[PDB]
Design an enzyme around this catalytic site. Structure first.
Site, mmCIF file in Angstrom:
data_model
loop_
_atom_site.group_PDB
_atom_site.id
_atom_site.type_symbol
_atom_site.label_atom_id
_atom_site.label_comp_id
_atom_site.label_asym_id
_atom_site.label_seq_id
_atom_site.Cartn_x
_atom_site.Cartn_y
_atom_site.Cartn_z
ATOM 1 N N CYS A 135 25.389 22.452 -34.949
ATOM 2 C CA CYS A 135 26.321 22.932 -33.921
ATOM 3 C C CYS A 135 26.980 24.265 -34.298
ATOM 4 O O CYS A 135 27.507 24.949 -33.419
ATOM 5 C CB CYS A 135 27.394 21.850 -33.648
ATOM 6 S SG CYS A 135 26.815 20.143 -33.995
ATOM 7 N N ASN A 177 36.783 13.872 -12.676
ATOM 8 C CA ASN A 177 37.373 12.871 -11.786
ATOM 9 C C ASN A 177 38.330 12.045 -12.639
ATOM 10 O O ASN A 177 37.883 11.175 -13.407
ATOM 11 C CB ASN A 177 36.304 11.995 -11.139
ATOM 12 C CG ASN A 177 36.875 10.999 -10.135
ATOM 13 O OD1 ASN A 177 37.969 10.455 -10.317
ATOM 14 N ND2 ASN A 177 36.114 10.738 -9.073
ATOM 15 N N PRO A 205 32.866 11.113 -20.668
ATOM 16 C CA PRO A 205 33.790 12.133 -20.147
ATOM 17 C C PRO A 205 34.649 12.830 -21.187
ATOM 18 O O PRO A 205 34.936 14.017 -20.996
ATOM 19 C CB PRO A 205 34.645 11.335 -19.150
ATOM 20 C CG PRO A 205 33.738 10.285 -18.671
ATOM 21 C CD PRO A 205 32.980 9.862 -19.895
ATOM 22 N N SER A 265 33.861 13.417 -24.347
ATOM 23 C CA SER A 265 32.971 14.059 -25.312
ATOM 24 C C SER A 265 32.324 15.286 -24.680
ATOM 25 O O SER A 265 32.397 15.508 -23.477
ATOM 26 C CB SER A 265 31.857 13.105 -25.764
ATOM 27 O OG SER A 265 32.353 11.879 -26.242
ATOM 28 N N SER A 266 31.656 16.076 -25.505
ATOM 29 C CA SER A 266 30.836 17.132 -24.956
ATOM 30 C C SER A 266 29.597 16.534 -24.287
ATOM 31 O O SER A 266 29.071 15.510 -24.727
ATOM 32 C CB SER A 266 30.415 18.113 -26.047
ATOM 33 O OG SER A 266 29.676 17.459 -27.054
ATOM 34 N N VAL A 277 34.120 20.191 -23.955
ATOM 35 C CA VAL A 277 34.183 18.926 -23.224
ATOM 36 C C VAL A 277 34.032 19.178 -21.723
ATOM 37 O O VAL A 277 33.355 18.426 -21.015
ATOM 38 C CB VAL A 277 35.499 18.183 -23.553
ATOM 39 C CG1 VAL A 277 35.848 17.172 -22.470
ATOM 40 C CG2 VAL A 277 35.382 17.483 -24.890
ATOM 41 N N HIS A 331 28.023 22.154 -24.012
ATOM 42 C CA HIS A 331 27.794 22.275 -25.456
ATOM 43 C C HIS A 331 26.300 22.419 -25.764
ATOM 44 O O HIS A 331 25.671 21.509 -26.311
ATOM 45 C CB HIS A 331 28.386 21.050 -26.160
ATOM 46 C CG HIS A 331 28.398 21.142 -27.659
ATOM 47 N ND1 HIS A 331 28.148 22.314 -28.343
ATOM 48 C CD2 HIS A 331 28.614 20.195 -28.603
ATOM 49 C CE1 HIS A 331 28.220 22.084 -29.646
ATOM 50 N NE2 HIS A 331 28.500 20.806 -29.833
ATOM 51 N N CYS A 382 32.802 22.730 -35.874
ATOM 52 C CA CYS A 382 32.218 21.762 -36.789
ATOM 53 C C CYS A 382 30.735 21.584 -36.489
ATOM 54 O O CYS A 382 30.228 21.994 -35.430
ATOM 55 C CB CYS A 382 32.939 20.409 -36.696
ATOM 56 S SG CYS A 382 32.771 19.636 -35.070
ATOM 57 N N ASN A 383 30.016 21.000 -37.446
ATOM 58 C CA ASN A 383 28.592 20.806 -37.205
ATOM 59 C C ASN A 383 28.140 19.525 -37.882
ATOM 60 O O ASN A 383 28.674 19.122 -38.924
ATOM 61 C CB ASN A 383 27.724 22.021 -37.648
ATOM 62 C CG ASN A 383 27.747 22.292 -39.169
ATOM 63 O OD1 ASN A 383 28.383 23.245 -39.622
ATOM 64 N ND2 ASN A 383 27.003 21.493 -39.948
ATOM 65 N N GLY A 384 27.159 18.878 -37.262
ATOM 66 C CA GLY A 384 26.555 17.704 -37.845
ATOM 67 C C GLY A 384 26.115 17.954 -39.268
ATOM 68 O O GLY A 384 25.550 19.009 -39.584
HETATM 69 CL CL LIG Z 1 26.654 20.769 -43.184
HETATM 70 RB RB LIG Z 2 32.527 15.619 -20.749
#
Ligand SMILES: [Cl-]
Ligand SMILES: [Rb+]
Ligand SMILES: [Cl-]
Ligand SMILES: [Cl-]
Ligand SMILES: [Cl-]
Ligand SMILES: [Rb+]
Ligand SMILES: [Rb+]
Ligand SMILES: [Rb+]
Ligand SMILES: [Rb+]
Ligand SMILES: [Rb+]
Ligand SMILES: [Rb+]
Ligand SMILES: [Rb+]
Ligand SMILES: [Rb+]
Ligand SMILES: [Rb+]
Ligand SMILES: [Rb+]
Ligand SMILES: [Rb+]
Ligand SMILES: [Rb+]
Lengths: 396, 395, 395, 396
Positions: free
Chosen positions: D92, D227, D248, D250-251, D348, D352, D382-384
């Protein structure tokens, strides 16, 4: 009654060797195997031409990627006239015997005089399926479905493998891992003994594989694999720990085909053909799907009754060994001693190309009758879904 | 040989490819048609049915023995004998023939026969996973093309066999388009006059996540006709010079059809009222790529087997694999179109290939009842070079 | 370049290079990469794995490897979870561009200890199904070979690299015979180096869990030389008149390679003994189907960046994507073969594409030591039109 | 960083962000990237596309994109075949690490004009068949979803990042309701920015040629989907019953690309270019993979220290909203009030596209500083795998 209907004679039969899964015959398609069995059977009838064949019924279960009408491809591959009526039959494991019944009926209603019937299966060439590529699957891992598992070996209702139902059969009629193992050993020995004596030489049609000289597959591939040591020590295949059904005491996955030639009484005398056998009667039966293992206990008496013949009058039985427990359960339920059953071995040792095996066991039954000097035989084969088919022949 | 009676028949609506019935499997469609036809016979229980023959061509991923799944889903007894039959497009009719033969040899008194196809749910195939392929792009085979629509010898789709049929007997893009419009209009007239309502058993598809329940009552294809769009569409199999198009060909479809057959004895025993009597049948075959004109052999063979002349037939169902197929066979047998497919044909109605053999027989009985006819004939060509034909008498 | 902080190589290591579906095919790309990283760090007296601050690791065919191949290589080698990790893809140049980025990160002061290199498991590259989300309603579909698609096919021309090798033979006038004699010479050099133990230091043997355990110690491809078969085989990309063959091309391969880089201040702080100093580098690019001779631009650029004249280089590593690539770049630059790939090149050793850039650098340091040289230059072309080059001084 | 050569941002541009299988699903990742590159360059008065020397472009799920996604982006945008092109994957964070590497290449003097950013077409991520080369003899087989495997699943635990988001909610004490009300606020900020035209400058609308009318895609697809009642009533996405993370809040999965144009001090003066911003510094950091959610709490102070800037001097932050809980936790750990965070909404509500988001938020950050008349900005993402990247800019 049968005598109110015209007679039907078997004038020849033939079968390929039975290859192992991804084995000796894995390079041939199901129609190539079927054409081979049909051509070899017809070459045995003195006085009959392949152009005399009017209609074909051929069993085949896992037809995916085989192409339009497997039976039509078997018929044209064998050099039959393009005027030939061809129908593919799917009664899972019994398909090869139901195709023969339907062929016999077509003569008896008077719509043909010369019919070729049997079955074929190339389990090596059964594909995997991608089931949701048309509508798509938006997100998530997806599945490649094994066509053998889905269309050949899984009961549709319970979504349960037949081996788990064979395990149910062992629980139902009290047969242990040892009882199934020692039966399995005995039929492998019977099959090996038949191989050693040359008793499959007549029925088998060797296959020549191109490539300079040619390779020839002459023997069934599974009988030589018997190792009693590993057989008794192997881990069970469907229930870890307390299972009784193993791969060695089950039927394998296999490739093969078999064919018989049927003629009416008119054509038999009109062409002066030598009959090998007469079809005396048949029976289909079915019960609970998970109890298909013992459906021959219904089909066999019904076929004997249709034939007007007693169970004690039968010289040799072919009870298809979908699993060793299947042979043991039906022998117990019918009161048939093993000394009259699968005398040259059965599918556990020989192989189980599912669409062909109904015709394979009839081909072998005729050999058993000639070899052991009997007259009346009965073939019985169960099929996934709860059914079974049985046939009664008189050797002439 | 004993007589064979049709005591009832039923068919699903014919759904469009990936359309109104695409959520249902071939055994789900087939069971629906079976219990619908059985409910029409007072005095016959579903447990009276001893054997089933059901057609199904593209059986991949349907599961073990499609005909067994059709029977059990319909409520038939686990004791029923069940066999699936594949004669490609003739499967549904050859099943009925085998069913009648089983009554005639005395092995059954009540048989259900017919056919089903869910072309929407035919998969793709990966054929070389078991041995693998070390390096190279690989193919996923469309099961409809491989096992339904491609001739085995020529490896050419059915529309190219139909272009042969056009050049062989002399039918143009115009003559085929005019026929397609005529059969579309005939199909739309029957819907409006309610002439399909008896034979069609509607399917209830209940949605229940708050979604609304859906009922499919009509065949999906007939309403789609647009003669302006039809005439001006481009050819589908041969560019520029081709005469065959998607609007004048049969579509891919989902559907099922079934008949209940009884013996002379059982009809008397249970006091059943018969709809028709099977008079005779005929299978024929010739060169695989000439399958389009195999009905020209099957239809007279079935007429001869039944002891009935061609001029005695009140209505023919000649399955419209393509508009040109009806036109070619109508030429070779000398049949006027005024006695063919009087409620429309498969170009306008749909063509679930495993089912159509029983679908046109079902509709044929509706033709004879509506037109007050006596003798009907149905013939259906099938890939590979064959055809099947059957002759009924309404009672 | 000299006006920036100096960058030292304190160690390097590589796996053996395994053949396609061969001796290392059971290991994933991060498992190969972790093995090379761990083995390189073990050689540095006075540096701990926990001192490594940042990793750049090349990898081209990353499908199904999982999130961030470089991060997996780093954690698998025992580095701290604090380590910054970035995966780099410049196709065949990935492993050398990774080292350039690692050097730059030391130069800009953002790290003092960097591990860089590359890894590839071509054996474990998957096939792709590209259209399952939206579906494909009708028609045969394809399974895309990931090696062909993401490794070996030029995107603009949709032609495999072998056909770019043939462009190169045509453009610079190298016959089948010239390419074959080059290939034999480089196989002979690789076999000689093998037998003399000259790869022993750089290679970290791989132990496979056992049967008993198997150890892979040698590169798999060099032993495959058969000069008679090589001269007689048919051409692989153009029938009849082709010049490029599988023997005289690089193979598909598995492997990894890593270097450890430190700043001048960290070298002194920890009292480390450097193996070499990076003097300069250069990337260049030109028309994509002419990627084969992009090193003729990148090598002069690296030499100028390094402030070193071409004649002062004691040994060159010119990656042998194909034999014709070495021939053409030697011709264009005027480099005699007696200074090129002195222990053999990728035609004979193998070409794990994301790793080869670092693999040739590790081998070059061995060559400079074995042949008593001081200044080396590595140059590697890459699919897309590019090349990367680097100049080192052995200390 | 102050003693290091200066690096100027002379323009930036981004595609609209399309929903998964939505407005931009017909475009490949390099088509999206080419669009962003070309649009950013068109904004620089006095700089030609032929002046660009080197490209770094982020891209995570590169399967089936073909050789070197960054090269395809560059050539598709009309850059010279001489351009040096490298694809970058820090999951990410890829799009921001790409810009860092681009700035470094100016600082070490190896380029004077660099394009950097990232692209992702999550719609066109394929599925994988992993065992076709060696084969699989018998059994159902898996088709791996490339998004799940290479984009969304932590390699160590085999754990989806949403499950590690729940670990963040549990670790730092954020309820379902706190995450939902954050999500509603950031959707409202995105909608408000949209409606006021505050994305018009940074977005390059995409014209899709009709195969059929043409279609112009102008706005981000996701903000309008808010919504509030349904957002508060929806089931959790990863932990049934007690879960706090939802689709909703989350990205989403998304398609898009973004690019920045970077020049050296010498080149800025040579071509008399008007700079938009200066890069003051950056920082990458990492910790335990399953704690990737709060890695920006390490990267942001490191980038600020690198830049010589105090946290309190920052006028606007972009903290990438991988999940609502990620923004809440990093605001809590760093003591950053929400009124300084994602002033035009975040991922969000905007979407993304994972390879592009690091560059997407920097483009948006430059828009926020201009609209709010700020001077100093900081983006952190941040990244996975446990990492994060951050960068500090000064608007000129
Ligand atoms: Cl990493
Ligand atoms: Rb979302
Ligand atoms: Cl059954
Ligand atoms: Cl046929
Ligand atoms: Cl390139
Ligand atoms: Rb013969
Ligand atoms: Rb024989
Ligand atoms: Rb066995
Ligand atoms: Rb009824
Ligand atoms: Rb009805
Ligand atoms: Rb149509
Ligand atoms: Rb060490
Ligand atoms: Rb030391
Ligand atoms: Rb070593
Ligand atoms: Rb080679
Ligand atoms: Rb410009
Ligand atoms: Rb704009």
């Amino acid at each position: 009654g049968m005598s109110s209907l015209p007679a039907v004679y078997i004038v020849s039969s033939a079968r390929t060797p039975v290859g192992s899964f991804l084995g000796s015959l894995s390079s041939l398609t199901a129609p190539q195997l079927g054409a081979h069995a049909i051509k070899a059977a017809l070459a045995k009838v003195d006085g009959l031409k392949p152009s005399d064949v009017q209609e074909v019924f051929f069993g085949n279960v896992i037809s995916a990627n085989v192409g339009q009408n497997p039976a039509r491809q078997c018929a044209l591959g064998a050099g039959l006239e393009e005027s030939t009526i061809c129908t593919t039959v799917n009664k899972v494991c019994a398909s090869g015997l139901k195709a023969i019944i339907l062929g016999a009926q077509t003569i008896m209603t008077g719509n043909a005089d010369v019919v070729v019937a049997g079955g074929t299966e190339s389990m090596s060439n059964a594909p995997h399926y991608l089931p949701n590529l048309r509508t798509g699957a938006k997100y998530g891992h997806q599945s490649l479905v094994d066509g053998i598992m889905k269309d050949g070996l899984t009961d549709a209702g319970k979504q349960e493998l037949m081996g788990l139902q064979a395990e149910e059969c062992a629980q139902d009629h009290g047969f242990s891992r040892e009882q199934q193992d020692e039966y399995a050993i005995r039929t492998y020995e019977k099959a090996q003994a038949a191989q050693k004596a040359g008793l499959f030489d007549e029925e088998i049609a060797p296959i020549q594989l191109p490539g300079k000289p040619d390779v020839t597959v002459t023997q069934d591939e599974e009988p030589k694999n018997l190792n009693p040591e590993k057989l008794r020590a192997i881990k069970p295949a469907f229930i870890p720990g307390s299972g009784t059904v193993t791969a060695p005491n089950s039927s394998p996955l296999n490739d093969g085909a078999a064919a018989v030639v049927l003629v009416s009484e008119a054509k038999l005398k009109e062409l002066n053909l030598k009959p090998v056998a007469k079809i005396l009667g048949w029976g289909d039966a079915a019960q609970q799907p998970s109890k298909f293992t013992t459906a021959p206990a219904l089909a066999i008496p019904k076929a004997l009754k249709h034939a007007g013949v007693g169970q004690d009058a039968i010289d040799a039985f072919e009870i298809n060994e979908a699993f060793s427990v299947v042979a043991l359960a039906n022998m117990k339920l019918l009161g048939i001693p093993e000394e009259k059953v699968n005398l040259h071995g059965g599918a556990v040792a020989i192989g189980h190309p599912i669409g062909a095996s109904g015709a394979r066991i009839l081909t072998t039954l005729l050999g058993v009758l000639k070899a052991k000097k009997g007259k009346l035989g009965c073939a019985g084969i169960c099929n996934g879904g709860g059914g079974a088919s049985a046939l009664v022949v008189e050797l002439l």
